[PDB]
Amino acid sequence: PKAQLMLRYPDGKREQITLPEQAKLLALVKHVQSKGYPNERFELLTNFPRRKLSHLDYDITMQEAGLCPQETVFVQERN
Amino acid sequence: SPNRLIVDEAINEDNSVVSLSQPKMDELQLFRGDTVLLKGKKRREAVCIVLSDDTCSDEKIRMNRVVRNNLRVRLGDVISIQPCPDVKYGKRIHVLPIDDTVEGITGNLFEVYLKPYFLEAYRPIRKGDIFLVRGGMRAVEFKVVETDPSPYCIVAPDTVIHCEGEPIKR
């Protein structure tokens, strides 16, 4: 089973990916880093309600993180 | 006409959000947080975020007063909705406060109203929109007089927000 993620990067480009629901939140973070947005400088947000995913334990599953079955995730430079 | 829908009142009101039943969202292949383009009367359009609502009848769409006004529609009127995935991050938007909502207003409109309003919420906004922001001593309305790209965009953290000079009417 797979989670569908609509990623919005800070230049406004979009990417739709899938990840296994059972995969670590860390897999998402690493994916965003391979796209040129490293964890040390960028964080992950959802809207409605606003949740800061980069405050979570990354060893948590995508399902536990609340990103299944689909979620829009914003990539944003840290303050 | 699966994407023409009856306007219904909002629950959990927000200027950037409209709600559909999950089946109608499947029917139209809309996902959570997708941007969508809405068409109302007098060639008025609006761009919003769509969320699912187990409370909403299939053939209806929930939207608040701000969005209904921007579409010139009333409860019970019909609008159309379509996917709108290519809306860009804004370089810059220009907004101006409505004169009769800031008559006594002292203070910085950007710091008290606009900055928290737009903060990290990725609001879609369109030229001509009027929106109501709470805060301060009383709520203020602003009109979008220009966006770049035109005529709509997403107000991102890097989107420059200009709040010019004299308030305007209508």
Contacts of A12 in chain B (CB under 8 A): 88-89, 154, 156
**Encoded tokens for B8:** 């219904």
The answer to whether the CB atoms of A11 and B122 lie below 8 A apart is: no
Residue from the list A12, A47, A70 with its beta carbon closest to the beta carbon of B31: A70
CA distance B132 to B137: 14
CA distance B27 to B22: 8
Residue B159 and residue B90: Cα distance in Å, rounded? Answer: 5
Q: At B51, is the secondary structure helix, strand, or coil?
A: strand
The runs of H, that is alpha helices, within B28-158 are 65-70, 109, 115-118
How far is it, in rounded angstroms, from Cα B33 to Cα A70? 9
**What is the CATH code for A1-79?**
3.10.20.90
Residues of A in contact with B156 (CB under 8 A): 10, 12
Considering CB atoms only, which of A6, A48, A77 is closest to B31? A6
For strands B92-97 and B160-163, give the pairing. parallel
- In B, minimum Cα distance to A9 occurs at B89
Question: Which is nearest to A72 in space by CA: B69, B50, B99, B155?
Answer: B50
Preceding peptide of B151 cis, ω within 30°: yes
3-state secondary structure of B112: helix
* Among candidates A12, A71, A76 on the partner chain, residue whose Cβ is nearest the Cβ of B33: A71
Smallest Cβ–Cβ distance between A70 and the set B32, B88, B158 belongs to B32
Domains and CATH numbers, chain B: 1-86 (2.40.40.20), 87-170 (3.10.330.10)
At residue B73's C-alpha, the angle toward residues B31 and A47, to 5°, is 30
Give Rg (Cα) of chain B: 16
Closest-approach residue (CA) in chain A for B87: A12
Chain B partners within 8 Å of A14 (Cβ): 85
Q: What is the resolution of this structure in A?
A: 2.4
Q: For A22-27, which contacts have Cβ atoms below 8 Å and span 24 or more sequence positions?
A: A22/A61, A22/A62, A22/A63, A23/A61, A23/A62, A24/A58, A24/A59, A24/A60, A24/A61, A24/A62, A25/A53, A25/A56, A25/A57, A25/A58, A25/A59, A25/A60, A25/A61, A25/A62, A25/A64, A25/A65, A26/A58, A26/A59, A27/A62
Domain ranges of chain A: 1-79
Residue spans of alpha helices (H) in B28-168: 65-70, 109, 115-118
- With contact defined as beta carbons under 8 Å apart, do A7 and A16 qualify? yes
- Torsion over CA: B145, B149, B153, B159 (sign): negative
